[PDB]
């Protein structure tokens, strides 16, 4: 529970940041 | 289509008369494709509900409660509580589902037509075998006398034959883990695998 | 202004079995009428009883005479003079609280008090309306207005003075009361405030301590509540002042369930006549039963139903019935045997309870994270 | 001021007697402890119930047969105490991540 | 380690709450991550080792 | 997201008046029938003495 | 005055739809799937407006290659008398034309006109049957869904069965997900709508739903299979699936969806003996709608046959209206099992005479038979001692030191590991 759920949440947090970062990069580019 | 439907209706009621189930099912399915699904051009047969009830009771006779319930859903709602040709199925099967088997033993003679007893009898055997299974998985030890009383085998010899037919035996006084360390070890090795070998 | 609930909770709204429809309560309300003449308590009376009596208009005559006189005074001093801010206009509003609120209705005085709130600046007037329409929402059953007033008083008003909102938990004492609001914060501020009442306008101190006891024992069963309500000073003094509630509390604390049940019945009966009554009296009297039972089951592994009846009041059969309807609710962990007559308690140890709590909180978090991982990354 | 004080002292000394004895025992009949302590069955039963209810003496009473049981609660539960609170901590983290998703 | 994970997770929640009011402009996240990794390896090794000890070091 | 228009998005009639519109959330045991508390105790206790 | 606001809203919707079309083209650019669900995600919000002037301007701007497909909508389309290509004669992207035809269909649909919408949807599918591009598979899923929405109010769902079957097989061959999910959900609705529950169940068993399918389609499929197995008597899996779907159900919208799901989960639960939580009978969006089912649940928990009969006679139209009248028949016949369920949860042991007294069974043998049937199923765990009359329940052994926590934790940690792995695979770094 502890370390595995924490790792999953951390991975998801790293995911969404990229998805914003990719979205922001696209917007800066239309 | 009236001709073909009557062919299959006479054939199905003859299967009632001829007493063959494997053909009975096929007559049932084909004329179900002929009774009430998408037909709509033939006049309402006076013998629709009769065989809806017969087919439902047959389906109950071989422990097909799910399929039986689907066929119950098929027929219209105005007739479950009104049309006696299916009020006799629905009443009996409701008593079955509630567990009021004795109500079934009282109402076995409440059939609306003589073309019911043929599988009323085999329903009587279906309920008794289901009840026997229930007693076997309900009790730890069950006495000879009370078993004969509740097994619905009026002849004690019949009760003894039905007892030998199963592994559920008479009893002496007439009174009938580890750490597997492999699958869990496989689990922890799998966890390590999902941690290792990169993404 | 309008202290004794105008008896409207007990007058003709508490009829039938408690039968309070015409009695000395009628005389008390008509005394609070002939002084401070009223037709607002007659609203449900125009429909049910005391509708169109001779006195209704035989007092209407000079009630209207006096009220036009007073509002005319307020007008002429508001228009002939130009008093500003906290001024005679505020006097018109507070009179119209003693008036039209206590003449015909709140609504026009809601208009007047909102207008003077836009006019006046200080917090005393708005807290005056806070308790005015709070008690009004007790009379006419308004709650959105009351919670708006409380949020205004706390979040933004309470940056100068303080000390007044605490006794306004009465509305929360009867807002979500059947659920959490008869207690928890409804006690922790009562317990916070019981030392310093300073709000005799809303109710007498004795009734305040009775309410405090009622909310405290439901809030805290024995979570070292003795440090706050039993060992408390002012509470103990007023319990010395009120023997009935003192017995009602100490019986629970001292496990005198035989007399605690009689005290619970008595408090329930006197409880059916309050602002508290209508929402949660059923809930309070069921919950206290749960608490007393669970208190006995604790420190106990298995109990004979005979000793259950003998030491917990009475009723072997009654205790099976009540304990059954209560375990069926899932609370009061215990498993009961028949004519063997054993009541096996099955409260999980902290370890198994921790495992179950893990399963629950996990499954909730896993549901949330699964939904998140599914909406994200498609 | 002397009735209350001495009643409190009597209760406290009853407690001290009941803890200073029963240390040898793990499962002793209430009749034995009452005869060794010279109280009535009901009064000593109520006193033991009060003692356990106050968590002054760890145990539980099986009145269905009429015996007092003794045990201890292992404090290893601290790991689960940390676990659950960290669980709702990550729950609030997930809520903030949900808000960040609403940003997207 | 689970207590340290507590405190690191509280720091993570506070930092992430700040992140939302933060356009691109010691992280509790990394320290949390290596704490998770150490707990991972230690606990999984202990479980697996105990279970192999159950199997190979058997009376039979 | 699909509003599931395949399902008739059931209009709540004409958003008519509810029961009480309270914040008083209850449980399943609050809707049973009881008959006060004093009478329960006494009527159950005269069979043994009060 | 009204014309000015209408023109401004028409211009903003034209720009939004232009953004959608440009989004289709830069999705077909880059040869990638996705960024087209970014296109179709908010078609409800844009379909909210759907004025005539904006549609006509979009048609005249992005169908500069005037074809017969544009000349078929024009007869039924009402073009403004008095009234933009973002510009050469490059051939139109098939995804773009399909999307534009989709909005034309939806405008022609929301205006209560069905037959011409039927024909135009048919011609939309006749051309989409010719394309073999994955860029026209996620669009095609939503074209199929809105087409079946067009057809639903025209009461001709049966004729669509062959087409949906063929396109579902086409999707399965091409390993489509969005089209496959939409077609499977729509065809399950087709089978259940004509009460072909056996057919739908048999189709379900041999069809595997894609795990990558979008959340809402997954919720729809879960609902459909849950209804199938609930009327198929698989109550435990039924309730599990509807709880999952409600967890996947949208919180704000899908009021009708959540209402039907709540109703069927209530009946499934109390058929299994579980009592639905009262809070779901309290939200304003569900209170009065479940008020018939709320009275149902009140009668079920009270269990009095008189109030039960009055509730049935008063709300049978609602009971059948959801296809639950047979379900409520089984409900009326399982309330007794429910009663036995709380009886056994409360009591470790109970004499069958006491069972008959608390349940009004009027017979110890009747109580024996009913309790035996109930304990046959996984409702009550006990050990009946007919030597004395005990219904002694199984010893509640410690859940810890019983390997059950290990299995539950193994499943949960596997779930977290899959979540982490899928998250780390879905990082999706860009080229530049």
CB B121 within 8 A of CB B86: no
Same domain, G228 and G335: yes
DSSP state of G342: H
Distance from CA of G251 to the nearest CA of A (A): 21
Distance, in Å, from the CA atom of C148 to the CA atom of C151, rounded to the nearest integer, reads 5
DSSP class per residue in G261-297:
HHHHHHHHHHHHTPPPPGGGGTSHHHHHHHHHHHHHH
Residue of A nearest to G405 (CA): A1
Secondary structure letter of residue C20 according to DSSP: B
**In terms of domains, do G264 and G322 share one?**
yes
B69: left (phi over 0), alpha (psi -120 to 50) or beta: alpha
Does some domain include residue B28?
A: yes
Tell whether B199 is covered by a domain. no
d(CA B144, CA E27): 76
Measured distance CA(B110)–CA(G212) in Å, rounded: 55
Burial of D56 (0-12, 13-18, 19+ CB in 10 A): exposed
User: How far, CA to CA in Å, does C165 sit from each of C90, C105, C113, C170, D51?
Assistant: 21, 25, 19, 10, 40
Do C212 and C194 touch, CB atoms closer than 8 A? yes
Structure token pair of residue A3: 């370390």
Looking at the structure, tell me whether residues G303 and G405 fall in a common domain.
no
Beta pairing partners, G382: G393
- CA dist C139 and F24 (Å) reads 18
- Tell whether B174 lies on the interface with G, counting CB pairs under 8 A: no
Q: G145 is written with which tokens?
A: 């869904």
Give the Cα separation of G249 and C80 in Å (integer).
65
Q: Which of G18, G178, G166 is nearest to G85 (CA)?
A: G18
Which residue is associated with the tokens 């040709």? B85
> Distance from CA of residue G316 to its chain's centroid?
24
Beta bridge partners of B175: B143
Residue B143's DSSP bridge partners are B175
Alpha carbon distances (Å) from G176 to G138, G139, G141, G173: 8, 12, 9, 8
Instruction: Say if the Cβ atoms of E2 and D83 lie within 8 Å.
Output: yes
Domain that holds residue B185: 1-194
Q: Do chains D and B touch (3 or more CB pairs under 8 A)?
A: no
C-alpha C345/C-alpha G84 separation (Å) is 78
**DSSP one-letter code for C219:** H
Within 8 A of D93 by CB-CB distance, chain A residues are: 9, 13
* Contact predicate F32/C321, CB 8 Å: no
Burial of G9 (0-12, 13-18, 19+ CB in 10 A): middle
Q: Is G397 found in the same domain as G347?
A: no
> On the CB side of D98, how many CA atoms lie within 13 Å of its CA?
13
Distance separating alpha carbons of residues C136 and C134, to the nearest angstrom: 5
First to last CA, chain F: 66
- What is the Cα–Cα distance from D65 to C341, expressed in whole angstroms? 10
Q: What is the 3-state secondary structure (H, E, C) of B37-64?
A: CCCCCCCCCCCHHHHHHHHHHHHHHCCC
3-state secondary structure of G225: helix
Tell me how far apart the alpha carbons of residues C158 and G130 are, in angstroms, rounded to a whole number: 71
Are residue G324 and residue G234 in the same domain, yes or no?
yes
Cβ-based neighbour number of residue E25 at 10 Å: 3
Strand arrangement of the beta sheet that strand C302-303 belongs to: C335-336, C343-344, C302-303, D60-62, D67-69
Q: Are strands D67-69 and D60-62 parallel, antiparallel or unpaired?
A: antiparallel
Q: Report yes or no: B190 and B196 within 8 Å, Cβ to Cβ.
A: no
Judge: A15–G426 Cβ closer than 8 Å, yes or no: yes
**Which of C308, C318, C378 is the best substitution to test chain F (most F C-beta atoms within 10 A)?**
C318
- CA pair distance D7, D1, nearest whole angstrom: 10
Q: Let me know how many helices (H) and strands (E) chain D has, helices first.
A: 4, 2
Contacts of B59 (CB under 8 A, 6+ apart): B65, B67, B68, B71
β-bridge partners, G385: G390
- Where b means 16+ CB within 10 Å and e means fewer, G89-103 reads eeebbbbbbbbbbbb
DSSP string, G129-194: TT---THHHHHHHHHHHHHHHHHHTTT--TTHHHHHHHHHHHHHHTT-SHHHHHHHHHHHHHHHHT
Q: B138: how many CB neighbours lie within 10 A of its CB?
A: 21
Give the number of C-alpha atoms closer than 13 A to the C-alpha of residue D78, restricted to the C-beta side: 6
C159: left (phi over 0), alpha (psi -120 to 50) or beta: alpha
**Residues linked to residue D61 through DSSP beta bridges, in sequence order:** D68
- State this model's resolution in angstroms: 3.2
Answer yes or no: are the C-beta atoms of G228 and G323 closer than 8 Å: no
DSSP output for A1-30: -HHHHHHHHHHHHHHHHHHHHHHHHHHH--
Nearest CA in chain D to A14: D97
Report the distance separating Cα G101 and Cα G143, nearest Å: 9
DSSP code of F15?
T
Q: Name the residue with tokens 């009473």.
A: D61
Phi-psi region of G155 (alpha: psi -120 to 50; beta: other; left: phi over 0): left
- H or E stretch covering C321: helix C316-327
CA D52 to chain centre: 5
* Distances, alpha carbon B31 to alpha carbons B3, B36, C123, C363, D2, in Å: 12, 9, 85, 50, 99
Q: Say how far apart CA C169 and CA C180 lie, in whole Å.
A: 13
What single string gives the DSSP state of each residue in C51-62? -S-HHHHHTHHH
Nearest Cα residue to G289 out of F25, F10, F20 = F10
Please identify which residue in the block is written with the tokens 């009550």.
Answer: G380
- Beta bridge pairs of residue D69: D60
Residue with tokens 């053909």: B23
Among G120, G92, G112, which Cα is nearest to G28's? G92
Query: G46, G70 in Cβ contact below 8 A?
Result: no
DSSP 8-class letter at C225: G
Radius of gyration of chain D (CA): 23
HSE of B131, CA atoms in CB hemisphere, 13 A: 24
Match 């830069």 to its residue by tokens.
G26
The DSSP output letter for C7 is: G
> Two tokens at G184?
């499977």
Q: Which residues numbered 167-206 in G keep a CB inside 8 Å of some CB on F? A: 186, 189
Cβ neighbours, 10 Å, residue B196: 7
List all residues 6 or more positions away from C164 whose beta carbon is below 8 Å from its beta carbon: C127, C153, C199
Are B43 and G171 a contacting pair, CB within 8 Å? no
Domain holding G344, by residue range, is 223-352
State how far the alpha carbon of F28 is from the alpha carbons of C320, G81, G300, in Å: 20, 64, 12
- C-alpha to C-alpha distance for B50 and B197, rounded to whole angstroms: 67
Query: Which residue from E minimizes the CA distance to A18?
Result: E24
Instruction: Tell me whether residue G35 is exposed, middle or buried, using C-beta atoms within 10 angstroms of its C-beta: 0 to 12, 13 to 18, 19 or more.
Output: middle
Using CB atoms within 10 Å of the CB of residue C277, give its burial: 0 to 12 exposed, 13 to 18 middle, 19+ buried: buried
Question: Token digits for G425?
Answer: 């695979």
- Pairing assessment for the beta strands C343-344 and C302-303 based on DSSP bridges: antiparallel
User: CA gyration radius for chain G?
Assistant: 28
For C18-59, where are the alpha helices, taking DSSP H only? 24-34, 54-58
Question: d(Cα D37, Cα B110) in Å, to the nearest integer?
Answer: 74
Quick one: tokens of G363? 């017979």
Among C154, C144, C87, which residue's Cα sits nearest to residue C123?
C154
Residue C149, φ and ψ in degrees, nearest 5: -65, -40
CB-facing half-sphere around the CA of B19: CA atoms within 13 A: 7
Maximum CA pair distance of chain A? 43
CA max distance for chain E:
65
Q: Phi first, then psi: give them for residue G384, nearest 5 degrees.
A: -75, 125
Residue D67 main-chain phi, psi, to 5 deg: -140, 155
The total of other beta-carbon atoms located within 10 Å of residue C164's CB is 17
Contacts of G137 (CB under 8 A, 6+ apart): G171, G174, G176, G178, G179
What token pair was written down for C341? 């007559």
Cβ pair B195, E43 in contact under 8 A: no
Provide the Cα torsion B46, B50, B52, B56; round to 10°.
180
Q: Identify the CA nearest to D100 among candidates G318, A20, C82.
A: A20
**DSSP letter, residue C177:** I
User: What residue spans of B108-155 are helical by DSSP H?
Assistant: 117-138, 144-150
Which structural technique was applied? cryo-EM
State whether D82 and E6 contact (CB < 8 Å).
yes
**Exposure class string for G306-343: b at 16+ Cβ within 10 A, else e:** eebeebbeebeebbbebbbbbbbbbbbbbbbbbbbbbb
In DSSP terms, D60 is beta-bridged to D69
CA–CA gap between residue C200 and residue C3 (Å, rounded): 10
Instruction: State the CB neighbour count (10 A cutoff) for residue B114.
Output: 8
Residues from chain F that touch G220, judged by Cβ atoms under 8 A, are 2, 4
Q: How far apart are CA G209 and CA C144, in angstroms?
A: 48
Residue C335 pairs in a beta bridge with C344
Q: How far apart are CA C262 and CA G265, in angstroms?
A: 43
Instruction: Let me know if chains F and E touch, i.e. at least 3 Cβ pairs under 8 angstroms.
Output: no
- C272/C285 Cα distance (integer angstroms): 11
Angle between helices C316-327 and F38-45 (to 10 degrees): 140
Is there a contact between C362 and A15 if contact means CB atoms under 8 Å apart?
A: no
| SS3 per-residue string spanning G12-32 | HHHHHHHHHHHHHHHHHCCCC
The answer to whether the Cβ–Cβ distance between A19 and C369 falls below 8 Å is no
User: How many C-alpha atoms does G58 have within 13 Å on its Cβ side?
Assistant: 30
Q: List Cα–Cα distances, C43 to C8, C12, C139, G66, in angstroms.
A: 11, 12, 11, 73
Q: Please give the Cα distance from B56 to B54 (Å, whole number).
A: 5
Same domain, G333 and G409: no
Q: Please, is D20 exposed, middle or buried when counting C-beta atoms within 10 Å of its C-beta (0-12, 13-18, 19+)?
A: exposed
Residue G291: which of G273, G266, G271 has the closest Cα? Answer: G266
Kindly list the distances between the CA atom of residue C193 and the CA atoms of B155, C135, C176, C239, in Å, as whole numbers in the listed order.
82, 19, 20, 16
The CA distance from C344 to G223, in Å, is: 42
Neighbours of chain B (3+ CB pairs under 8 A): E, G
Is residue C177 within 8 Å of C279, Cβ to Cβ? yes
Contact assignment for C279 to F50 by CB distance below 8 Å: no
Six-digit token string for C13: 């709204």
Q: Which of D80, G418, C273, G400 is nearest to E2 (CA)?
A: D80
Q: Are strands C343-344 and C335-336 parallel, antiparallel or unpaired?
A: antiparallel
Indicate if G340 and G412 belong to the same structural domain: no
Per-residue DSSP letter, C344: E
State how far the Cα of C107 lies from the Cα of D14, in Å rounded to an integer. Answer: 66
Neighbours of chain C (3+ CB pairs under 8 A): A, D, F, G
Do residues G269 and G331 both lie within one domain?
yes
**Partner residue facing G288 (CB), from F4, F12, F31:** F12
DSSP state of C153: I
Residue C156 is classified by DSSP as: I
Which chains are within 8 Å of E by 3+ CB pairs? A, B, D
User: Contact G257/F7 with Cβ under 8 angstroms?
Assistant: yes
| C6: exposed, middle or buried (Cβ count in 10 Å: 0-12, 13-18, 19+) | buried
- Domain tally for chain B? 1
Q: Which residue of D has its CA nearest to C226?
A: D54
Can you tell me whether residue E47 is helix, strand or coil?
A: helix
Nearest CA in chain C to G35: C378
The label of the residue with tokens 């917007």 reads A27
Does the CB of G369 have a partner CB in chain B at under 8 Å?
A: yes
Residues 1-60 of E with CB under 8 A from B: 40, 44, 47-48, 51-52, 54-55
Q: Does C377 contact A15 at a Cβ distance shorter than 8 Å? A: yes
Residues in chain C with CB shorter than 8 Å from the CB of G346 are 324, 327-328, 336
Contact exists between D and F (3 or more beta carbon pairs < 8 Å):
no
Q: How far is CA C330 from the centre of its chain?
A: 27
Q: Do chains C and G touch (3 or more CB pairs under 8 A)?
A: yes
């Amino acid at each position: 529970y502890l370390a595995s759920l924490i790792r999953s949440v951390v991975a998801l947090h790293n995911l969404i940041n990229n998805k914003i970062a990719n979205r922001d990069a696209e917007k800066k580019e239309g | 289509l009236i001709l073909a439907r009557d062919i299959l209706e006479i054939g199905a009621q003859w299967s009632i008369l001829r007493k063959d189930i494997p053909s009975f099912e096929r007559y049932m399915a084909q004329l179900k494709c002929y009774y009430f699904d998408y037909k709509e051009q033939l006049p309402e047969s006076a013998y629709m509900h009769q065989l809806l009830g017969l087919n439902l009771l047959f389906l109950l006779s071989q422990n097909r409660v799910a399929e039986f319930h689907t066929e119950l859903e098929r027929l219209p709602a105005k007739d479950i509580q009104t049309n006696v040709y299916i009020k006799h199925p629905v009443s009996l099967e409701q008593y079955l589902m509630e567990g009021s088997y004795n109500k079934v033993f009282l109402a076995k003679g409440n059939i609306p037509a003589e073309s019911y007893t043929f599988f009323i009898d085999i329903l009587l055997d279906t309920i008794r075998d289901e009840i026997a299974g229930c007693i076997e998985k309900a009790y730890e030890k069950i006495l000879f006398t009370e078993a004969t009383r509740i097994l619905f085998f009026n002849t004690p010899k019949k009760m003894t034959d039905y007892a030998k037919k199963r592994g559920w035996v008479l009893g002496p006084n007439n009174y009938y883990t580890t750490i597997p360390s492999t699958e869990l070890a496989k689990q922890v090795i799998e966890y390590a695998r999902q941690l290792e070998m990169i993404v | 202004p309008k202290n004794p609930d105008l008896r409207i909770a007990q007058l003709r709204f508490l009829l039938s079995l408690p039968e309070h429809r015409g009695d000395a309560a009628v005389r008390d309300e008509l005394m609070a009428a002939v002084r401070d003449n009223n037709m607002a308590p007659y609203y449900e009376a125009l429909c049910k009883s005391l509708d169109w009596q001779i006195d209704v208009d035989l007092l209407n005559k000079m009630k209207k005479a006096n009220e036009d006189e007073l509002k005319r005074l307020d007008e002429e001093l508001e228009d002939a003079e130009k008093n500003l801010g906290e001024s005679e206009i505020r006097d018109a509003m507070m009179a119209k609280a003693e008036y039209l609120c206590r003449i015909g209705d709140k609504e026009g005085a809601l208009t007047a008090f909102r207008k003077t709130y836009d006019k006046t600046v200080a917090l005393g007037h708005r807290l005056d309306i806070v308790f005015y329409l709070l008690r009004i929402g007790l009379f006419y059953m308004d709650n959105d207005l009351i919670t708006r007033n409380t949020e205004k008083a706390k979040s933004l008003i309470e940056e100068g003075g303080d000390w007044d909102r605490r006794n306004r938990l009465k509305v929360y004492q009867g807002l979500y009361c059947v659920a959490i609001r008869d207690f928890k914060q409804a006690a922790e501020l009562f317990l916070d405030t019981v030392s310093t009442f300073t709000s005799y306008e809303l109710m007498d101190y004795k009734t305040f301590v009775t309410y405090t006891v009622y909310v405290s024992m439901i809030a805290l069963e024995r979570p070292d509540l003795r440090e706050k309500v039993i060992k408390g000073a002012e509470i103990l003094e007023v319990l010395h002042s009120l023997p009935a509630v003192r017995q009602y509390l100490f019986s629970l604390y001292e496990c005198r369930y035989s007399v605690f049940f009689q005290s619970l019945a008595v408090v329930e009966q006197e409880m059916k006549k309050d602002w508290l009554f209508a929402p949660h009296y059923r809930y309070y009297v069921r919950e206290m039963r749960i608490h007393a039972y669970s208190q006995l089951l604790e420190s106990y592994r298995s109990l004979t139903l005979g000793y259950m009846a003998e030491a917990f009041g009475v009723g072997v059969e009654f205790i099976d019935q009540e304990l059954s309807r209560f375990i069926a609710a899932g609370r009061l962990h215990c498993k009961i045997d028949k004519v063997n007559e054993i009541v096996e308690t099955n409260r999980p140890d902290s370890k198994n309870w921790q495992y179950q709590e893990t399963i629950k909180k996990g499954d909730l978090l896993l549901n949330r994270v699964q939904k998140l991982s599914r909406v994200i990354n498609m | 001021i002397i009735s209350t004080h001495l009643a409190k002292l009597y209760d406290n000394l009853l407690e001290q007697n009941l803890i200073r004895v029963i240390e040898p025992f793990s499962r002793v009949q209430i009749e034995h402890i009452s005869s060794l302590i010279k109280l009535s069955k009901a009064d000593v039963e109520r006193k033991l119930s009060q003692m356990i209810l106050d968590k002054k003496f760890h145990g539980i009473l099986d009145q269905g047969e009429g015996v007092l049981i003794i045990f201890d609660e292992p404090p290893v539960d601290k790991t689960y105490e940390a676990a659950l609170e960290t669980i709702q901590n990550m729950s609030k983290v997930v809520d903030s991540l949900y808000n960040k998703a609403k940003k997207l | 380690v689970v207590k340290e994970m507590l405190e690191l997770a509280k720091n993570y929640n506070k930092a992430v709450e700040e992140e939302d009011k933060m356009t691109p402009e010691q992280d509790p996240k990394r320290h949390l991550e290596e704490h998770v990794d150490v707990l991972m390896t230690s606990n999984i090794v202990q479980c697996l080792a105990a279970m192999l000890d159950t199997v190979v070091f058997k009376l039979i | 997201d699909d509003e599931f228009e395949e399902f008739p998005a059931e209009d709540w009639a004409g958003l008519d008046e509810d029961e009480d519109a309270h914040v008083w959330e209850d449980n399943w045991d609050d809707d049973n029938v009881e008959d006060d508390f004093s009478n329960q105790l006494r009527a159950e206790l005269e069979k043994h003495g009060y | 005055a009204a014309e000015h606001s209408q023109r401004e809203l028409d211009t903003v919707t034209l720009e939004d739809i232009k953004e959608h079309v440009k989004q289709l083209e830069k999705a077909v650019s880059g040869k990638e799937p996705r960024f087209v669900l970014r296109a179709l995600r908010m078609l409800p919000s844009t379909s909210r407006r759907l004025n005539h002037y904006v549609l006509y301007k979009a048609v005249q701007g992005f169908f500069t290659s005037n074809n017969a497909t544009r000349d078929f909508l024009l007869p039924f389309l009402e073009e403004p008398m008095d009234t933009f290509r973002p510009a050469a004669s490059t051939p139109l992207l098939p995804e773009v034309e399909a999307y534009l035809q989709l909005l034309v269909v939806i405008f022609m649909m929301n205006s209560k006109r069905y037959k011409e919408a039927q024909k135009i949807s048919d011609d939309l599918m006749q051309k989409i049957s010719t394309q073999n591009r994955r860029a026209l598979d996620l669009v095609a899923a939503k074209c199929y869904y809105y087409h079946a929405r067009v057809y639903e109010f025209l009461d001709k769902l049966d004729v669509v069965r062959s087409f949906l079957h063929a396109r579902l097989r086409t999707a399965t061959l091409r390993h489509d997900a969005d089209g496959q999910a939409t077609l499977l959900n729509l065809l399950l609705r087709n089978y259940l709508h004509y009460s072909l529950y056996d057919q739908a169940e048999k189709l379900v068993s041999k069809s595997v739903f894609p795990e990558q399918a979008n959340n809402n389609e997954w919720a729809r499929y879960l609902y459909y299979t849950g209804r199938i197995k609930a009327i198929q008597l698989e109550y435990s899996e039924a309730r599990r699936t509807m709880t999952n779907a409600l967890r996947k159900a949208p919180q704000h919208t899908a009021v009708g969806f959540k209402q039907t799901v709540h109703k069927l989960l209530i009946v499934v639960e109390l058929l299994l003996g579980e009592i639905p939580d009262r809070l779901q009978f309290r939200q304003p969006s569900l209170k009065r709608s479940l008020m018939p089912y709320f009275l149902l649940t009140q009668a079920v928990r009270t269990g009095n046959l008189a109030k039960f009969n009055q509730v049935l006679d008063q709300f049978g139209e609602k009971f059948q209206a959801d296809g639950t009248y047979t379900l409520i028949i089984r409900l009326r016949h399982n309330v007794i099992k429910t009663g036995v369920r709380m009886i056994s949860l409360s009591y470790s042991r109970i004499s069958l005479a006491d069972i008959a007294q608390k349940l009004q069974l009027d017979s110890p043998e009747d109580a024996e038979f009913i309790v035996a049937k109930a304990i046959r199923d996984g409702v009550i765990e006990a050990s009946i001692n007919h030597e004395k009359g005990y219904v002694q329940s199984k010893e509640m052994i410690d859940i810890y030191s019983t390997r059950e926590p290990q299995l539950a934790f193994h499943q949960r940690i596997s779930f977290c590991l899959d979540i982490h792995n899928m998250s780390v695979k879905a990082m999706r770094f860009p080229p530049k």
